Curated annotation (Swiss-Prot):
Homodimer. Dimers or tetramers in inactive state. On DNA damage, autophosphorylation dissociates ATM into monomers rendering them catalytically active. Binds p53/TP53, ABL1, BRCA1 and TERF1. Interacts with NBN (via FxF/Y motif). Part of the BRCA1-associated genome surveillance complex (BASC), which contains BRCA1, MSH2, MSH6, MLH1, ATM, BLM, PMS2 and the RAD50-MRE11-NBN protein complex. This association could be a dynamic process changing throughout the cell cycle and within subnuclear domains. Interacts with RAD17; DNA damage promotes the association. Transmembrane segments: none annotated. Changing E627Q: In a lung adenocarcinoma sample; somatic mutation. The chain holds residues 3 to 1140 of 3056 of the full protein. This is Serine-protein kinase ATM. The gene is ATM. Induction: By ionizing radiation.
């Protein structure tokens, strides 16, 4: 046993290069069972799992002293060693992975295998992962596996994920890039460099970024072949140099504009339905670059005509509307005139009209210069549009999109008629936009609109009941008529097995309160509401008993349990007893245990992002439990009858954790005093994470509660210290972190001693190296409401800040932010209050 595999390991010496031809299979067989050998690997077979490197090449690479399958077999053997597959073995997964480099004459068998080997390894580390460059060197070389091409992005992820690291100006690829951009294939996966570039983008000069762009572009422009790459291409400067181009306006961009020239007709290059334009939504977004780089009429001229050509400017139209505000109110007519002709008549003209309607909407806030002639023409078109008055949908959009020209009301007929919400709940609001009273002139409209409200009998309306309710003016003429009207349906359709979960039905629940409690006084009708209570009490237990399928709808139903309160307001504020008192015990445990019920039970970037997988995308089932947890979140939301269910729930939640990360997510989602162990979740949990994960990102919201609390009073900070020790002690590996730890400083009074109610030396230390001074924001609170010697201390800090500024290529242009705009930021704090010494700093200026 102890030596049994050691025999096989001794046999691995005999399964080394010479005699290997059998015992390796026998090992692979010994592998094929190897009882508790991974346990021994967790015990002594790590060395075997390491011999699974160490002996392996000693078997293999020594035997390696045609027929590449031997490697592939050895690869299989490794893959078999890998097929331990519980296994981790990062060292070989480095070294053997290093050994899995070319440069370890290869079968390239690690190509997906390392990629395969990249999942929870790349959970753990990189270290350098400099072999990314070797890999980069590898792809830089001649032979074809497009595998590396996106697998670059893996290395990029390897940097881009936990690395807190980058370098070489990403230049090697960048160098290769335009080199590749001479002529090549395998580009879209290879486009992953853009991501790497995007990844690279951190805290560096867009100038430093600016190199290759048009360089690819025209060379790029020649082929379309993968729009994906092209899209992938379409990305970057359309942010980055857009980040450059969002800038100098306030602050070769012409060449970029020239590079953008390449776009201008690249618009024309579009073959495609609106599909190319649809695909060009990005390019439309990229066209927003073209917005203001002044051509808007040349667009209207490019809009001079045209069947699909309609769609283009039509597409372009919203982009024009969208990509900024402030086109020419002069050009408005130029559009509006051009718009007048086109937008009306076609099957497509609707989209144009919708755009025009949107453009019209876009015209609305367009302001400052009044000639209403266009508006009149529009008001004329307002008829001419309302003249068309026949559509599937976009009129629903176009409606207020026309109506915002105010928002005639002659179509309040169609509003009373709205059964024929998409427009309406808006258009009605757009109508309710007239006044409390104004649009109401027909006394029948409201119930007619409530008869127009017989259609959904539109969850998007969540407050539009009050919007529906807006006509009362204390008349209450139709008041209860509609109230029972569905309440009739509420009875009239009453079935336990029927469709249309009561969500939408309960969606009327406080709509009454959306009239009166909007405008006991509420609790009077609570029965007519409590009708929903049973309606709510209708479906509750069923899957709550069942633990079977189909409850996604119910989850979707339970999704409305996310109608929230969480603050101080009239309207949703009115929802509270309309919810909370409304369900006192109703589902209270009934929902609750269902959680305890739930309790026991292109993607390629996730090799590193298995943690991101560990973050996010795992499981739809119990996403309900999440939806439940969300529904459960109401408890906390409620927590300011049957509250201790919440207390139970955490006490329940307290139990232990893997998908319980999502529970740990819930663990955040939170006596509050007594609740301290709610943290104690993290206390193991965080400690468990060596956390290449963002994981404590949520910890902030948790710490937010910790804040919302912090002897009995004590350990939380003491823990949250460890939370800080999670970082300050870490003193490394954020790229992210501390922004909440920054936020943590609210309520100012060894290892943890210095920080507690000071901590700012970190905030001081927070200054220089970051996404550049990510922390720089954190300046804001720094003194933000101090006391005097505190302000003095704060000054001393402000000094210590000014002091901190000391330490800070274009890293100076970075220090320009990084010392300076940061120190300039350091001002902005001084921009706050007092104890100024204000330009006594600017003495430094």
């Amino acid at each position: 046993l102890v030596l049994n595999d050691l025999l096989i390991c001794c046999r691995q010496l005999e399964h080394d290069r010479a005699t290997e031809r059998k015992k390796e299979v026998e090992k692979f067989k010994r592998l094929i069972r190897d009882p508790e050998t991974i346990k021994h690997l967790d015990r002594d077979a790590v060395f075997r799992f390491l011999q699974k490197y160490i002996q392996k090449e000693t078997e293999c690479l020594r035997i390696a002293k045609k027929k590449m399958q031997e490697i592939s077999s050895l690869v299989k053997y490794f893959i078999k060693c890998a097929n331990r597959r519980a296994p981790r073995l990062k060292c070989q997964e480095l070294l053997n992975y290093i050994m899995d480099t070319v440069k370890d004459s290869n079968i390239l068998l690690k190509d997906i295998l390392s990629v395969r080997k990249y999942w929870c390894e790349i959970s753990q580390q990189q270290w350098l992962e400099l072999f990314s460059v070797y890999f980069r060197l590898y792809l830089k070389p001649s032979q074809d596996v497009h595998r590396v091409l996106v697998a670059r992005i893996i290395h990029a992820v390897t940097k881009g994920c936990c690395s807190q690291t980058d370098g070489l100006n990403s230049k090697f690829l960048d160098f290769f890039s335009k080199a590749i951009q001479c002529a090549r294939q395998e580009k879209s996966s290879s486009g992953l460099n853009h991501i790497l570039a995007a990844l690279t983008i951190f805290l560096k000069t867009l100038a430093v970024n600016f190199r290759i762009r048009v360089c690819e572009l025209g060379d790029e422009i020649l082929p379309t072949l993968l729009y994906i790459w092209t899209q992938h291409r379409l990305n970057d400067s359309l942010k980055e140099v857009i980040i450059e181009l969002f800038q100098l306006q306030i602050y070769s961009t012409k060449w970029r504009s020239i590079l953008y020239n390449l776009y201008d007709l690249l618009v024309n290059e579009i073959s495609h339905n609106i599909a190319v334009k649809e695909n060009l939504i990005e390019l439309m977004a990229d066209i927003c670059h073209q917005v203001f780089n002044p051509w808007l009429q040349i667009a209207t001229q490019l809009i001079s005509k045209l069947s699909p050509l309609l769609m283009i400017l039509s597409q372009l139209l919203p982009q024009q509307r969208h990509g900024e505000r402030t086109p020419y109110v002069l050009r408005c007519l130029t559009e509006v005139a051009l718009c007048q002709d086109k937008r009306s008549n076609l099957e497509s003209s609707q989209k144009s009209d919708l755009l025009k309607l949107w453009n019209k909407i876009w015209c609305i806030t367009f302001r400052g210069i009044s000639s209403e002639q266009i508006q009149a023409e529009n008001f004329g078109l307002l008829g001419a549009i309302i003249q068309g008055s026949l559509v599937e949908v976009d009129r629903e959009f176009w409606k207020l999109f026309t109506g915002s020209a105010c928002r005639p009301a002659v179509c309040c007929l169609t509003l009373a008629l709205t059964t024929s919400v998409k427009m309406g709940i808006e258009q009605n609001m757009c109508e309710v936009n007239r006044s409390f009273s104004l649009k109401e002139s027909i006394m029948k409209w409201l119930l007619f609109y409530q008869l127009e409200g017989d259609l959904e009998n539109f969850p998007h309306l969540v407050l539009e009941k009050i919007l529906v309710s807006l006509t009362m003016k204390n008349c209450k003429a139709a008041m209860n008529f509609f109230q029972s009207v569905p309440e009739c349906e509420h009875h009239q359709k009453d079935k336990e097995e029927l469709s249309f979960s009561e969500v939408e039905e309960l969606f009327l629940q406080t709509t009454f309160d959306k009239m009166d409690f909007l405008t006991f006084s509420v609790h009077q009708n609570l029965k007519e509401s409590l009708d929903r209570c049973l309606l709510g009490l209708s479906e509750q237990l069923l899957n709550n008993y069942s633990s079977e399928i189909t409850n996604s709808e119910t989850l979707v139903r339970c999704s409305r349990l996310l109608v929230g309160v969480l603050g101080c307001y009239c309207y949703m504020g009115v929802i509270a007893e309309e919810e909370a008192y409304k369900s006192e015990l109703f589902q209270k445990a009934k929902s609750l245990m269902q959680c305890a019920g739930e309790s026991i039970t292109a993607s390629f970037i996730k090799k590193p992002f298995d943690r991101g997988e560990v973050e996010s995308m795992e499981d739809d089932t119990n996403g309900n439990l999440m939806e439940v947890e969300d529904q459960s979140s109401m408890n906390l939301f409620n927590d300011y009858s049957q509250s201790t269910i919440g207390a139970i729930n955490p006490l329940a939640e307290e139990y232990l954790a893997a998908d319980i990360r999502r529970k740990l997510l819930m663990l955040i989602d939170s006596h509050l005093h007594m609740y301290l162990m709610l943290l104690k979740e993290l206390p193991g949990e965080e400690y468990p994470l060596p956390m290449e994960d963002v994981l404590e990102l949520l910890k902030p919201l948790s710490n937010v509660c910790s804040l919302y609390r912090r002897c009995k009073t004590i350990l939380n900070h003491v823990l949250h210290v460890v939370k800080n020790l999670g970082q300050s002690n870490m003193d490394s590996e954020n790229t992210r972190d501390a922004q909440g730890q920054f936020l943590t400083v609210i309520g100012a009074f060894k290892y943890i001693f210095s920080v507690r109610m000071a901590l700012v030396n970190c905030l001081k230390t927070l200054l220089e190296a970051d996404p550049y001074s990510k922390w720089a924001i954190l300046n804001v609170m720094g003194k933000d409401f101090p006391v005097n010697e505190v302000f003095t201390q704060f000054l001393a800090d402000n000094h210590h800040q000014v002091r901190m500024l000391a330490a800070e290529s274009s890293r100076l242009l970075k220090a320009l932010p990084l010392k300076l705009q940061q120190t300039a930021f350091e001002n902005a704090y001084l921009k706050a209050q007092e104890g100024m010494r204000e330009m006594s700093h600017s003495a430094e200026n």
